Design a protein around this ligand. Structure first.
Ligand code: FMN
Ligand code: SF4
Ligand code: SF4
Ligand code: SF4
Ligand code: FES
Ligand code: FES
Ligand code: CA
Lengths: 905, 147, 156
């Protein structure tokens, strides 16, 4: 297509509208109601341009560029006089009722309405009458509501309802009294409600957790990082001020998590600011905890380790690839253990083997939205991999997109698409132990134990391909529903099979692999997705090592006297009594961690590791994508006594002091080169980010905006002398504003979006090749493995049907977005949001045991009687008991385990 | 009555055409009279209008082809199909065919409504049919077709 | 607190039979509840949402969009006087002043005994017989300020 804007000629896409085409060309058109992910509706009337019929047309006509297709030979004018006056008048009409609130507004300096008011040139008020006002609502602990600042752009309701599928937000009232909010006071129920603080162009919806410790955007120190709260690997921009983590902003990645986070990643950063975090190396002596600096801690640990006969290491999926590799080099490959349980490790390696040996392509998170049928087996994705659930919702709405495309309706005209596709949707079949949050759009939901879900998967695979093993004992109703699933999956152009390790069953993963193989054998374009548990679960699986049970056995027999535990609390993956006994028997326990854990009471040495905000490293995605996260701030900049080093720095210095009796800390690129040298499967982490010598025309990449304030006052209460700027030898970023953050800079890692005239999250438009697409020079992060040429064989181990045994209760896992993750549940803002720990009972089982709802029952697991109140679960199959994994006292390793002596307290 | 007489429902007049007629009572908003907002309010939603294209003829009520017509247009239809097209063209020598309900309201002598052919003078309606203005009142303005 | 009666639920489902989408019966469900109880409370919003299978936010947005669905308690009789242009020409302000003098309330309020609630309303489609009033289901035309007390005392 060819368009002529203001006399200049441009080549654009004809399938795009004029607003997105002109924004992709660098032209500035003000807009409110349009969003790249939400489509065009024509509400705010801000994007007005003057369209002419041909080249010899002088009158023209004002049209909305978001509602006008960028067809071939289209003549428009942005800088036309009448269009400029109309856009200024739209800004003025919005300004008539807007409150005098900018100094006490959390959106100030980050506000799209401020930027568009300045951009249109409106600065003079001639409206003299009263402004309408509104009462606010309580929206829960995360989102603060200020209804006075609304411009009625309908972005919130469109995102929350049409995109995110939420039900408790809406627009109420009439003409100029339109109210956007909930029908009553209460917490927003959506798992993706936190994206409202960037979707809303004004300060109506603000980050309440940030509002507690508010600072402006220009005062922030940003870094490009990876969210640590599950395996999905969403790109984030942590922003700090005065030595504490203050906000998590969405960092655009056109391949992974483009505009949207989930609420866990956005609001579960509060564990970084906990005051009980270790900040110095601490050595115990008798009952005295003496504080050491880094050098003498390294020397004492090196001599004590050298006096030992065998040192073993226990890694964690919390830690990065570099930290786990440094531990593996410190103790040796034969003495390195992964730190997760044996069954968890087996499920993780099975998922990994399906990913890089199953011969079936695994899609990225953005690519999930293009699949025409989804089968989810055992993985409650909303509570474990929430952004995958959001992408599955988009893939489900793909059917309405298809029927609209058949009627020659443009893909950005979202209201017409939704009107054509009323309730027709792509097939979604979710299986779980109970009801999921995806059941509102699912074509079918299967509530059954994990062996029954695996049997359903194997039956689907056998009905798709007769070479797959069959399942004996299928009821005709279940057989008919299996036939419905098979007819839906066979007729799909792009079927997608999603599973994961959170179900706690190996056979569910095997059944999902068999379904994917059966769909691959029919020539379909089948994709497979595996949801891991933690941020670097797949990297720990790729690196490998022994299980936690083997390390505990080595400590308990006495073959190992020294144990180094890296970023692992050890109670989520093993029984607490066994861990306590093994660590009390061990004469030397060293714990390298950034959070106060229960195993630090028995620790001889505690090394204060850095969290993700204070460390660099690489983490491996659930789809096998290596992604580098960068340090946000120096923890020793304000508190000079703080010795909080990177975990790989601690372990490399420990290995150097053990070998040559001298301290060499490290550089990060040296550890990365060591990883790609000793481990060839992790050789792709070299290309995840450029090294520390990378420059943009000779200068580093800036971590803070150019108007960063208080450079001679922020530390003045400690010392009037300004300290040295912290040096970053690890990465290409500088801990200052003396750097580059140009949107045209040839790089992939962007710490924050800012452009002149665009101070809001709409500044991400300038950093993309086309708006809503990819980053201009490619998205960061590379895939570790490609699709294998040949797949796996059919798994013939079909599990038997679930049989309830008397006195034994099979534990059905119930994951929660707020609580099941360890670090996020340590955050103080998650304590109010997470619920009380209930235990789920079938009505028949509760009636047999004589307990109603809310009554406390006590059960013994591993010789430990704990009591929980009973919640009646209708969908849970009898013979099962429901437990919330990841909570305090209920380890995620309990999923799939049995349970004895369920007695009323 | 029409359903009892076989003029509505299943197999109307033995043709095989099935048609049922419902009456949806409104809830008091003026914007509901706009045709796309009418379609939105018929679907049980807030009566916001829709952007055209697409027109309701291709995707209207519940995404189906839909035609919205005024009461008086549908009342003009049966006379056209019972008396002929040429009769409808041969009742007024104007560019707008057929008759139209025209009236005058306000402080006139006889406010009301009369069926008149197109091309009727507004002064003719005001004086002959409405009776002119009331006693002691002088005409100063008029609105031809509503608010 | 709120619970839909059997007649209300039956009428709502019968209205649900008339449409392709059950969401299309939301306006008439709100009107059924309003006819039974005078207005629509919040539990009615949740109950209608549960019956129709749509979220309560959509039901509340519909209820607060339309002016004739009352989300606040009203009196026993709703006086609705036309304040549009033809009735402004025909002198609705004298009728409004007479109503405010007889009832001692502002437009939009309810009398102390809960007997009358006064509301301005848009044009009633009776402009040739203006000024016009609409008490609960009865339209009264050719209004005069002297006939207002006679017209108001037949609604006990
Ligand atoms: C604000 C607005 C209100 C309208 N109200 C009505 C109305 O009350 N009755 C009506 O028949 N048309 C109304 N219309 C016109 C309709 O959009 C549409 O033209 C008409 O209902 C059907 O078209 P027809 O005249 O060809 O039959 C309204 C239009 C607008 C913009
Ligand atoms: S929303 Fe924007 S324009 Fe409105 S008060 Fe806040 S900063 Fe100012
Ligand atoms: S609350 Fe925010 S997103 Fe919603 S309509 Fe108002 S300004 Fe737009
Ligand atoms: S989906 Fe996972 S990686 Fe993404 S924001 Fe949520 S917790 Fe973080
Ligand atoms: S952005 Fe086009 S009208 Fe709102
Ligand atoms: S103007 Fe009052 S009835 Fe029409
Ligand atoms: Ca560093």
């Amino acid at each position: 297509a060819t368009i002529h804007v203001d006399g200049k000629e441009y080549e654009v896409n004809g399938a795009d509208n004029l607003l997105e085409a002109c924004l992709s060309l660098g032209l500035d058109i003000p807009y409110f109601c349009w969003h790249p992910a939400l489509g065009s509706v024509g509400a705010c009337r801000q994007c007005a341009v003057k369209q002419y019929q041909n080249a010899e047309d002088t009158r023209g006509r004002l049209v909305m560029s978001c509602m006008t297709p960028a067809s071939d030979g289209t003549f428009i004018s942005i800088d036309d006089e009448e269009a400029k006056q109309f856009r200024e008048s739209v800004v003025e009409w919005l300004m008539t009722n807007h409150p005098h609130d900018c100094p006490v507004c959390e959106e100030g300096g980050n506000c799209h309405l401020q930027d568009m008011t300045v951009m249109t040139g409106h600065s003079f008020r001639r409206y003299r009458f009263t402004k309408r006002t509104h009462r606010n609502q309580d929206l829960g602990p995360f989102i603060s509501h200020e209804m006075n600042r609304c411009i009625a752009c309908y972005r919130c309701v469109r995102y929350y309802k049409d995109y995110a599928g939420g039900t408790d937000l809406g627009v109420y009232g009439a003409h100029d009294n339109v109210y956007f909010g909930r029908p009553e006071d209460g917490t927003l129920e959506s798992e993706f409600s936190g994206n409202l603080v960037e979707i809303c162009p004004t300060g109506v919806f603000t980050d309440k957790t940030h509002s507690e410790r508010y600072n402006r955007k220009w005062d922030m120190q940003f870094a490009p990082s990876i969210c640590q709260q599950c395996s999905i690997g969403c790109n984030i921009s942590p922003g700090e001020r005065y030595g504490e983590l203050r906000r998590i902003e969405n960092r655009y990645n056109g391949t992974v998590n483009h505009y949207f986070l989930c609420d866990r990643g956005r609001f579960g950063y509060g564990y970084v600011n906990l005051k009980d975090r270790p900040r110095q190396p601490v050595q115990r002596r008798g009952d005295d905890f003496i504080t050491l600096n880094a050098e003498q801690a390294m020397q004492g640990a090196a001599d004590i380790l050298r006096q030992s006969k065998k040192v073993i290491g226990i890694g964690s999926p919390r830690a990065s690839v570099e930290s786990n590799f440094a531990l593996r080099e410190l103790v040796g490959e034969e003495n390195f253990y992964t730190g997760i349980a044996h069954g968890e490790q087996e499920r993780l390696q099975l998922a990994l083997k399906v990913l890089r040996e199953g011969g079936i392509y695994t899609p990225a998170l953005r690519e999930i939205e293009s699949y025409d049928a989804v089968l989810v087996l055992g993985e409650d994705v909303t509570q474990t991999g929430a952004r995958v659930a959001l992408a599955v919702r988009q893939a489900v709405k793909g059917k309405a997109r298809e029927m609209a495309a058949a009627q020659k309706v443009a893909d950005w005209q979202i209201a017409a698409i939704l009107n054509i596709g009323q309730r027709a949707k792509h097939p979604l079949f979710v299986t779980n132990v109970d009801d999921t949050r995806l059941d509102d759009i699912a074509a079918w939901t299967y509530r059954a134990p994990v062996e029954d879900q695996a049997r359903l998967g194997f039956a689907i695979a056998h009905a798709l391909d007769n070479s797959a093993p069959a399942v004996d004992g299928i009821e005709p109703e279940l057989q008919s529903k299996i036939d419905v699933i098979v007819q839906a999956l066979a007729g799909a152009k792009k079927p997608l099979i999603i599973s994961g390790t959170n179900a706690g069953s190996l056979e569910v993963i095997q059944a999902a692999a068999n379904v994917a193989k059966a769909l691959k054998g029919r020539g379909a374009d089948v994709g497979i997705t595996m949801i891991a548990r933690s941020v670097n679960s797949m990297g720990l699986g790729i690196m490998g090592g022994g299980s936690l049970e083997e390390a505990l056995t080595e400590l308990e027999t006495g073959r190992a006297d020294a144990v180094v535990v890296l970023e692992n609390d050890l109670h989520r993956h093993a029984s607490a009594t066994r861990v306590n006994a093994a660590l009390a028997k061990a004469p030397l326990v060293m714990v390298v961690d950034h959070q106060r854990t229960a195993i630090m009471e028995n620790a001889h040495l505690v090394l204060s590791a850095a969290s993700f905000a204070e460390s660099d490293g690489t983490v491996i995605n659930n789809e096998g994508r290596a992604q580098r996260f960068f340090q946000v701030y120096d923890p020793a900049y304000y508190d000079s006594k703080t010795v909080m080093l990177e975990s790989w720095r601690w372990l490399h210095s420990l290995h150097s002091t053990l070998l040559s009796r001298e301290v060499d800390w490290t550089q990060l690129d040296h550890v990365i080169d060591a990883v790609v040298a000793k481990i060839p499967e992790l050789a792709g982490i070299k290309d995840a980010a450029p090294d520390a010598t990378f420059r943009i025309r000779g200068q580093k990449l800036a971590r803070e905006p150019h108007r960063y304030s208080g450079r001679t006052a922020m530390r003045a209460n400690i010392s009037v002398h300004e300290p040295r700027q912290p040096q970053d030898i690890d990465t290409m970023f500088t801990f200052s504003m003396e750097g580059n953050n140009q949107p045209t800079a040839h790089r992939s890692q962007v710490p924050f979006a800012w452009a002149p005239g665009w101070n809001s999250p709409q500044a991400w438009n300038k950093f993309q090749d086309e708006v809503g697409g990819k980053l201009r020079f490619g998205d960061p992060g590379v895939r570790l493995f490609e699709t294998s040429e040949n797949g796996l064989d059919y798994f013939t181990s079909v599990p038997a049907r679930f049989q309830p045994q008397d006195g034994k209760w099979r534990i059905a896992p119930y994951y929660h977005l707020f609580g099941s993750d360890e670090l996020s549940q340590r955050a103080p803002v998650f304590q109010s949001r997470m619920p009380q720990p209930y235990i789920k009972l079938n009505p028949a089982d509760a009636a047999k045991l004589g307990v109603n709802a809310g009554t406390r029952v006590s059960f013994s697991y591993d010789g430990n009687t704990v009591t929980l109140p009973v919640e009646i679960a209708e969908g849970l199959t009898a013979g099962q008991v429901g437990l919330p994994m990841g909570m305090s006292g209920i380890a995620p390793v309990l999923a799939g385990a049995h349970l004895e002596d369920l007695k009323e307290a | 009555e029409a359903t009892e007489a076989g003029l509505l429902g299943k197999n109307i007049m033995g043709t095989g055409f099935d048609f049922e007629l419902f009456v949806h009572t409104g809830a008091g908003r003026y914007i509901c009279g706009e045709e796309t907002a009418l379609i939105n309010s018929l679907e049980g939603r807030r009566a916001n209008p829709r952007s055209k294209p697409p027109f309701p003829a291709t995707s209207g009520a519940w995404g189906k082809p839909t035609c919205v017509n005024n009461v008086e247009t549908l009342c003009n239809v049966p006379a056209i199909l019972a008396n002929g097209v040429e009769w409808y063209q041969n009742i007024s020598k104007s560019k707008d065919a057929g008759t139209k309900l025209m009236g005058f309201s306000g402080r006139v002598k006889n406010p009301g409504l009369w069926e008149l052919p197109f091309g009727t003078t507004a002064r003719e309606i005001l004086e002959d049919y409405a009776g002119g203005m009331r006693d002691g009142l002088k005409f100063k303005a008029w609105q031809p077709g509503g608010a | 607190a709120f619970e839909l009666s059997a007649a209300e639920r039956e009428a709502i489902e019968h209205e649900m039979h008339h449409y392709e989408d059950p969401r299309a019966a939301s306006i008439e469900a709100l009107k059924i509840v309003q006819k039974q109880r005078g207005w629509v409370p919040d539990g009615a919003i949740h109950a209608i949402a549960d019956v129709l299978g749509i979220p309560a936010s959509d039901v509340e947005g519909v209820a607060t969009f339309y002016s004739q669905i009352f989300r606040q308690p009203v009196g026993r009789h709703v006086i609705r006087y036309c304040d549009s242009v033809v009735c402004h020409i025909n002198g609705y302000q004298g009728i409004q002043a007479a109503l405010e003098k007889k009832l001692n309330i502002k437009p939009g309020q309810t009398t102390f005994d809960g007997r009358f609630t006064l509301l301005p309303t848009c044009c009633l489609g009776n402009c040739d017989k203006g000024p016009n009033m609409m008490i609960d289901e009865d339209t009264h035309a050719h209004l005069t300020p002297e006939a207002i007390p006679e017209l108001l005392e037949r609604y006990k």
